[PDB]
From a paper:
Here, we describe variants with all combinations of the aliphatic residues, Ile, Leu and Val, at a and d to give four classes of peptide: the ββ class, with a and d = Ile or Val; Lβ, a = Leu and d = Ile or Val; βL, a = Ile or Val and d = Leu; and LL, a = d = Leu. Peptides are named systematically appending the one-letter code for the amino acids at the a and d sites to “CC-[name]-“; e.g., CC-Hept becomes CC-[name]-LI.
As a = d = β-branched specify blunt-ended α-helical barrels, we explored all four combinations of Ile and Val at these sites. Concomitantly, the dimensions of the internal pore diameters increased: VV, 4.8–7.7 Å; IV, 6.2–9.2 Å; and II, 9.0–11.0 Å.
Numbering used by the authors:
A (entry chain B), B (entry chain A), C (entry chain B), D (entry chain A), E (entry chain B), F (entry chain A), ...: 1 to 30
Write the structure that this text describes.
């Protein structure tokens, strides 16, 4: 359904934020 | 539907936050 | 509809957060 | 409606977070 | 209604986050 | 209702994030 | 109900974020 | 149901953000 799919698009975007935060950890450590 | 589309607009905005955090990571690496 | 519009208002606010985070990247880089 | 209005209250609060992040950006620039 | 009130409780919590972020700006500036 | 109560649980968790950010502010001030 | 339980899973995840932010306060203070 | 499952996908993504923040904490401690 379109609303479940839209909700899933939110979850994928949140995963992008987690990845970006991971990059900041790499930046600090380096 | 309008609700599903508005939920997608939230997902797009959340992606924009991910891109901005990536910019912070790169600014730290530099 | 009023609920779709309210949801869209959330997406616009999230976009404001992304912009502010972009500013922090500029601040760090400078 | 009360639900749409409560959702708008969330959007206003999310804007307040954007303003606060802008203050961090300016504090770094200073 | 109970669901609108619960949603409003979310908005108030988000406002608490904005205030805390404001404190971080004060901390940095000081 | 169970849905309203679960939404309140999210609001309580969001408050916990505010408290944690306040701890960062105080750690910076110190 | 499954939707209330899913919402509760969101609240527990948000609590994990609060805990992680608490760790950052400890890291800064130390 | 598909909606409950999509909401769970959001919770999993939010956990991923917690793990990433923990990495920042450890990078600071190091």
């Amino acid at each position: 359904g379109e609303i479940a799919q839209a909700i899933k698009e939110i979850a994928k975007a949140i995963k992008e934020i987690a990845w970006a935060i991971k990059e900041i950890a790499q930046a600090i450590k380096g």
